[PDB]
Amino acid sequence: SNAMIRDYLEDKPLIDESVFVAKSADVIGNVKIGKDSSIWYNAVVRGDEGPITIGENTNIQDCSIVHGDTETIIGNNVTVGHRSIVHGCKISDNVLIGMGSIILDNAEIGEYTLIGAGTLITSNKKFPPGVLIMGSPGKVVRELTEEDKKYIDESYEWYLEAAQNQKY
Amino acid sequence: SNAMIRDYLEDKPLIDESVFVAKSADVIGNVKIGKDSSIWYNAVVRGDEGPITIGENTNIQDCSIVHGDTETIIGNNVTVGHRSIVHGCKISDNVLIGMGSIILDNAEIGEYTLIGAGTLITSNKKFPPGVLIMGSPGKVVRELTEEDKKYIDESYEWYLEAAQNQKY
Amino acid sequence: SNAMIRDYLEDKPLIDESVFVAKSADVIGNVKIGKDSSIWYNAVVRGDEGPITIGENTNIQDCSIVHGDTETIIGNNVTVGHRSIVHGCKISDNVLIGMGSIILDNAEIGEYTLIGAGTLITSNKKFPPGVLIMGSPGKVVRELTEEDKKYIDESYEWYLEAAQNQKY
Ligand SMILES: [Mg+2]
Ligand code: NI
Ligand code: NI
Ligand code: NI
Structure with missing residues (x-):
């Protein structure tokens, strides 16, 4: 990178050709989006x-x-549920964020974690992988079962599929 | 119905001609919206x-x-307050869902129910009719008064009027 | 003012030429927006x-x-954080409303007030100036320091810049 590239990246999201982006969604600024991800309505x-x-x-x-x-x-x-706010945090792979959740700056969510709807995670909170987290403030309920890690897998898989239909 | 109609239905919402749908809203997929209902901005x-x-x-x-x-x-x-999430649940007639509430799958709200702002109702939760429900998790506070039922009517009634002004 | 002006004001927001309004935002009806303010995506x-x-x-x-x-x-x-609902209330100068908060009708927030993310303030609720409010229901945590008030100023100031960059 160089001056002109940094300017480019500040203005043009690097969105992989494979990514579905709903027309009502706004993807603005410096944003890198990877293969087969999807951005839904009004995100x-x-x-x-x-x-x-x-x-x-x-x-x-x-x-x-x-x-x-x-x-x-x-x-x-990762599945980011409806109307969630993911704000300056770090979300490892295979995480399902429950709809309406808010995860603030510098929080870290470990791999294969399930977060209940409407969970509020304030800044700098770290969580071990393989757990269920719920509430405000968000706390660990129990370790995740194989059935739970599956549910996480089915959720992102479903979205891979629905993403095709919304433009094919 | 038949195969061609089922296919039409997965792509074209059945929206009654009387319904107001803000331009910024997205009504997508298998959706049926009845007479004089209204869909507001960015819903x-x-x-x-x-x-x-x-x-x-x-x-x-x-x-x-x-x-x-x-x-x-x-x-x-039914009045679905600003920013509410209604997800796979059953909402009876004359319900006012307080703004920012989240009602999950298979939950069931009885007729003439008033729900406070910011309420979180998890899945399969059921409630009797004629109540004030409130909080996270949502619980019944008391039974509804005639005054409360009136307020519920005035609410949707106001939206019938406002929707017409958004058409004329 | 007169009949025709009242009608115009009911249909056309008074937005200062200076204000950045994202294309996806809806500014509707009787709204007045002052110099150098900014309305962001899908608000x-x-x-x-x-x-x-x-x-x-x-x-x-x-x-x-x-x-x-x-x-x-x-x-x-004032900084109104992501996905907040500011509903029929009175918000003083130099206030930062944490993302995802809800402030209901007739609530009154005083000058130099900091509100944590996800705070729910119900109607008619009143607060003095110079405080940190947080939770559901929102309550005062402590009075604000100079370091805190500075944070408030830097927040709106950053947005002044950002708004300018979303135009030039
Ligand atoms: Mg929009
Ligand atoms: Ni932010
Ligand atoms: Ni869903
Ligand atoms: Ni309202």
Whole structure:
């Protein structure tokens, strides 16, 4: 990278050709989106402060908002539930964020984690992988079962499929 | 119905001609919206998983989201407050869902129910009719008064008028 | 004012030429927005019931909603965090509303107030100036320090820049 490239990246999201982006969604600024991910209706992914990196096969559902003081990193195979706010945090692979949840700056969610709807995770909170987290403030309920890790897998898989239909 | 009609239904919402749908809203997939209902700014009504049925005189306020693993049924004279998430549940007639509430799959709300702002009702939760429900998790506070039922009517009634002003 | 002006004001927001309004935002009805403020992606500012007044240098972040039974007043130098609902309340100058908060009708927030993410303030609730409010229901945590008030100023200031960059 160089001066002109940094300017380009500040203005033009690097969105993989394979990514479904609903017309009503706004993907603004410095945003890298990986293979087969999907951005749903009225979502806002704005990398104008901290940049945003979204992995592969990850879904950002309707009206969800991604923004951040520091960088926001969302892994591969992640499901971001409807109207969730992922703000400057770090989300490992195979995480399902329950609809309406808010995860604030510098929080870290470990791999194969399930987050209940409407969960509020304040800044700098770390969580071990393989757990169920719920509530406000979000706390660990129990370790995840193989059946739970599966549910996580079916969710992102479903979205891979629905994503095709919304333009094929 | 037949194969061709089922295919039409997965792509074209059945929206009664009287319904007001803000331009910024997204009504997508298998969705049926009845007479004199209204869909407000940036709402998202997505019936691409469980189909969605919305009754008559029912208002879905700004940035609300209707989606579901299972079928979502919203009755008549229902007021879905700003930014609510109604997901795979059953909402009876004359219900006012407080703004920012989240009602999950298979949950069931009885007729003439008033729900406080910011309420979180998890899946399969059921409630009797004629109550004030409130909080996270949502619980019944008391039974509804005539005064409360009137307020519920005035609410949807106001939206019938406002919707017409958004057409004329 | 007169009949024709009242009718114009009910249909056409008074937006200062200086204000950045994202294309995906809806600014509807009787809304007045002051110098150097900014309305972000997919926000809805609807003054079709109570009118809305937004001061100078104030930012209404993504998917935030402004609406109200009664009048809604937002002062100057205010930061309205992502997905907040500011509903028929009175917000003083230099206030930062944490993302995902809900402030209901007739609530009154004083100058130099910091509100944590996900806070739910019900109607008629009142707070003094110089405090940190948080939770559901929102309560005062401690008075604000100079370091805190600075944070408030830097927040709206950052948005002034950002708004400019979303135009040049
Ligand atoms: Mg939109
Ligand atoms: Ni932000
Ligand atoms: Ni859903
Ligand atoms: Ni309202």
